[PDB]
């Protein structure tokens, strides 16, 4: 009487652990809901996958979570916290490796 | 249900694009970007393509 339930796994999770070198555009982690939040130089897709916006080293950190005020449910959740409480989340950052360019001598006019 | 319809440019171009509108709803007139003209123009529903 139990049908369905034959769906395969989504192969989600972290694709780049901490310290892994990541080029711009590489997907860092795919998640179904926000297990890891985007940090510095990390973007978010429609499906909440984290990709590197710059070329660098992936780092995972814990930071205080302050949601966008337009996120009404999160704002209410915060409104219900006690005074000392601060929410925390796991964030993924890309520490950019190369400089974004150098000045070169082109012509000795 | 909804029906797929062919909005045809009122700008005289041969340009048409397919939209979805409820069968019970009135015939559609919609502003849309015409690539050939390179400007937003009116498109009018011409004929029903299919029922979806």
């Amino acid at each position: 009487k139990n049908l369905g339930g034959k769906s395969s796994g989504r192969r989600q999770g972290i694709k780049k652990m901490e310290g892994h070198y990541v080029h711009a555009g590489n997907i860092i982690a795919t998640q179904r809901h926000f297990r890891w939040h985007p940090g510095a130089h990390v973007g978010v897709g429609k499906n909440k996958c984290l990709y590197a916006l710059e070329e660098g080293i992936v780092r995972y950190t814990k930071e205080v979570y302050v949601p966008h005020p337009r996120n009404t449910e999160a704002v209410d959740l915060i409104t219900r916290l006690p005074k000392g409480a601060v929410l925390y989340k796991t964030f993924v950052h890309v520490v950019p490796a190369k400089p974004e360019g150098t000045f070169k001598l082109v012509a000795m006019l | 249900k909804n029906i797929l319809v062919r909005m045809v440019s009122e700008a005289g171009t041969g340009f048409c694009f397919n939209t979805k509108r409820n069968r019970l709803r009135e015939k559609l007139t919609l502003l849309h970007y015409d690539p050939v003209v390179k400007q937003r123009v009116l498109f009018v529903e011409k004929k029903k393509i299919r029922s979806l």
């Binding site: 985007p38 510095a40 130089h41 973007g43 710059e54 000045f103 | -």
Partner: protein, 141 residues
């Protein structure tokens, strides 16, 4: 000519070099968190119970240009340091200090209610008429 001995690669050490060329990186992440870190300089306004303060802070967190009604030089010219007049005055002082510091472009990140606030509107008007633009140029990739 020994004066024409120039290293093939130039090394500009000015911290604001790339930022002013509009080529420096901005922290483009933090989509799920408020405020965005995608800026070079941010205008942060703190309205305490008694004093109104404004800061122009670099992305790295260094405070670059501050204007606080707490300072005697400014509080010695206005009645209440916690009203629209105080906000506009601190905004104009900050605009002047920003111009003298070379900070023409800035990002302001208010909450919806902060934006709706008339005092914040007056502060933004003061800054824009003083010259500072509350919208940073896009990065050039």
């Amino acid at each position: 000519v020994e004066n024409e001995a120039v290293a093939p690669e130039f090394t500009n050490r000015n911290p604001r070099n790339l930022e002013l060329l509009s080529v420096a990186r901005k922290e483009r992440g933090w989509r799920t968190v408020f405020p965005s870190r995608e800026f070079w300089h941010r205008l942060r306004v703190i309205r305490t119970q008694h004093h109104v303060e404004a800061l122009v802070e670099h992305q790295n967190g260094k405070v670059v240009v501050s204007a606080s009604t707490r300072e005697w030089a400014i509080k010695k010219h206005l009645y209440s340091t916690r009203n629209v007049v105080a906000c506009e005055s601190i905004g104009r002082v900050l605009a002047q200090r920003c111009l003298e510091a070379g900070i023409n472009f800035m990002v302001y990140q208010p909450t919806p209610w902060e934006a709706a606030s008339d005092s914040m509107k007056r502060l933004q008007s003061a800054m824009t008429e003083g010259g500072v633009v509350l919208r940073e140029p896009q990065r050039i990739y």
